[PDB]
């Protein structure tokens, strides 16, 4: 009741990933919660419902939605008479983050936004009036969104405009708002180039990118990831978006990004990664097994012909479906990272973090 019930695991997991949770999109957490939304703020409940159903996806979109929900929560916050805001607000936000984690494991951008908000709340003087503190917190969140995402995207687009050349063939993977904005602004400014969109099952997010590239008038080819080795002879540049950059330089991105980096290296093609500095992390990963997300295994079912293979796959005791979400590209496979600070080597992630931490 007071604690949200834990989400149930869907089915059998791969033995190498048995430490990670595996959830079903159909089984939502709101089945055993009060509809007037007492325990958890209604904005957080709606946000978690949108997370668990895949309605909101992408690092920037998830971070922005979380920050807006947190603004709504702060606006409706009343300090207890025998408590201080700096402690009570931080203590109150924790069950909300636990519920959001239960709905879907938090992205790196969401984690960094949560840390920033907690630091901002803690640094509120006890003498400040409640409404003044709430207005300051909302203004801080607005500034965070404006500077860490929007202005950062504009600066990254301006920096990446220099790398794109006339006659280039740029290979992009999946859906990334930063990459799409970079390509659209490069096309608008006068650069002429082709884009090859590589997509993969089951999300097929690359189609999103494809649609945008046609609305902007950019010529675009489309193919699946297994055919990448066929198309890379034509490709002159690979441009990838990153969900996170780890302290050791590794790029944590959608599964298959490291595959594309490896094949591009085998084909002697430069690989560039676009990421905002607000998504840099102090964690380190050496592989995709230690920390990852296991999506719904049922998404791996496909309709080929009349029959459906893998239908009722749980009836086979030895059959496991592995719907990996993320993967880790080692820094040796990445040639360049474009951030709002400029073009940096993949090994400059730890220093940038330091530069962004001495201020705070």
């Amino acid at each position: 009741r007071q604690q949200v019930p834990t989400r149930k695991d869907y089915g059998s997991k791969v033995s190498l990933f048995s430490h990670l949770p595996q959830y079903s999109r159909q089984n939502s957490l709101t089945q055993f919660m009060s509809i007037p939304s007492s325990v958890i703020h209604p904005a957080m409940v709606r946000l978690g419902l949108q997370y668990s159903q895949g309605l909101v996806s992408g690092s920037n979109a998830r971070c922005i939605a979380l920050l807006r929900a947190l603004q709504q929560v702060i606006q409706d916050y009343t300090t207890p008479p025998n408590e201080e805001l700096s402690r009570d607000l931080v203590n109150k936000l924790k069950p909300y983050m636990s519920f959001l984690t239960q709905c879907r494991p938090l992205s790196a951008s969401m984690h960094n936004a949560i840390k920033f908000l907690n630091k901002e709340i803690t640094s509120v003087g006890s003498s400040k009036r409640e409404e003044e503190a709430k207005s300051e917190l909302r203004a801080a969140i607005d500034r965070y969104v404006q500077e860490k995402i929007v202005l950062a995207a504009q600066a990254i687009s301006r920096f990446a405009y220099q790398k794109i050349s006339n006659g280039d063939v740029i290979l992009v993977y999946g859906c990334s708002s930063l990459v799409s904005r970079i390509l659209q602004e490069a096309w608008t400014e006068g650069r002429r180039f082709r884009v090859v969109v590589v997509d993969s099952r089951p999300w097929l997010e690359g189609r999103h990118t494809l649609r945008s590239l046609v609305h902007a008038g950019v010529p675009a080819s489309y193919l699946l990831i297994p055919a990448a080795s066929y198309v890379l002879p034509e490709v002159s540049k690979v441009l990838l978006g990153a969900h996170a950059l780890l302290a050791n330089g590794s790029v944590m991105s959608r599964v298959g990004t490291a595959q594309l980096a490896l094949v591009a290296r085998a084909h002697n093609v430069p690989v560039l990664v676009c990421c905002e500095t607000y998504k840099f992390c102090e964690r380190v990963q050496t592989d995709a097994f230690v920390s990852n997300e296991l999506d719904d295994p049922d998404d791996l079912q496909c309709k080929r012909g009349e029959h459906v293979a893998l239908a009722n796959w749980q009836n086979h005791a030895s059959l496991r479906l592995l719907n990996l979400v993320y993967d880790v590209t080692p820094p040796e496979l990445v040639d360049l990272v474009i951030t709002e600070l400029g073009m940096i080597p993949c090994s400059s992630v730890p220093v940038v973090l330091r530069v962004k931490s001495s201020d705070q």
């Binding site: 040639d335 360049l336 600070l341 940096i344 080597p345 400059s348 220093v351 530069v355």
Partner: protein, 301 residues
């Protein structure tokens, strides 16, 4: 100072001290231009200095000159950020520029003192083209009572390798000149490779005389160490992705700037990736390539 007087001053500075680096001479000429400037605003001085840097880069197309000009521009910008009054800003600029010249006049000694301890006794050193910094490092190693052999590439088409060989023979060091094509043949003899650098790019790689990239590749194939010696003023904010990503103004000389004896106007510099570099010996110390980017990330922003 006008353009002609700037060019004359730069050339005279180079001529008076043959050992003086091109970037150092360019920085000294820029400081003289700052001293002789008549403007009373920061933006006018910045525009005049940018024009002077363009003139000097037209005179000399080396990456070192451009990096020195960019460093001087960043120096005046840093001086202007702290101080709002232009008179005090110019006075502090002149004093700190004199101190800057005095400090960077001693970079080679520090580099030699740091690097000469990496040359094992009874070892073979492979070198590409001519480099005053490498010459100073080998002088320091000899003065430390170390015996070693040197292989030097010819470094076509200017044959600076023979000049380096003569300079090393002046120091009584066994030096053998090999062809460029023979580099892959001779790598199995060299214990280590020491080369200079005309510029250190953001990622930690270098832009050097043509033929350095293949030397680095051959060294990586045989797992030989690859050492670069370069001063701090050679750090540039460039990020080439391949050989064609290097700006054309650096590949082809100042006076220089189909399908039948074309020769495509042979480039003078190429880019060596940081993965082929073991260590750098700068006046800031012994660094990994990844440190180089740090020195720039802290310099700006």
């Amino acid at each position: 100072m006008d353009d002609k007087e700037l060019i004359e001053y730069f050339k005279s500075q180079m001529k008076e001290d043959p050992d003086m680096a091109s970037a150092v001479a360019a920085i000294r000429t820029l400081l003289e231009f700052l001293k002789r400037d008549k403007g009373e605003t920061i933006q006018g001085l910045r525009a005049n200095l940018t024009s002077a840097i363009e003139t000097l880069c037209g005179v000399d197309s080396s990456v070192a000159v451009s990096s020195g000009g960019e460093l001087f521009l960043r120096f005046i910008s840093l001086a202007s950020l702290e101080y709002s009054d232009y008179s005090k800003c110019k006075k502090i600029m002149i004093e700190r520029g004199e101190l800057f010249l005095r400090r960077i006049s001693l970079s080679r000694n520090k580099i030699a003192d740091l690097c000469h301890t990496f040359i094992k006794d009874g070892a073979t050193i492979l070198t590409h083209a001519y480099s005053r910094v490498v010459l100073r490092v080998l002088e320091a190693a000899v003065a430390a009572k170390k015996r070693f052999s040197v292989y030097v590439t010819e470094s076509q088409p200017d044959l600076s390798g023979k000049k380096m060989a003569k300079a090393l023979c002046h120091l009584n060091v066994p030096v053998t000149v090999v062809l460029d094509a023979a580099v892959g043949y001779i790598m199995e003899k060299a214990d280590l490779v020491i080369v200079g650098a005309e510029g250190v790019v953001e990622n930690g790689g270098i832009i050097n005389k043509i033929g350095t990239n293949q030397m680095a590749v051959c060294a990586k194939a045989q797992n030989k160490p690859f050492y670069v010696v370069a001063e701090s003023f050679k750090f540039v904010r460039l990020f080439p992705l391949n050989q064609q990503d290097v700006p054309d103004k650096f590949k082809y000389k100042a006076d220089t700037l189909t399908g039948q004896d074309l020769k495509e106007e042979h480039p003078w510099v190429d880019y060596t990736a940081p993965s082929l570099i073991t260590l750098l010996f700068t006046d800031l110390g012994v660094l990994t390539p990844s440190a180089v980017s740090d020195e720039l990330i802290k310099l700006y922003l």
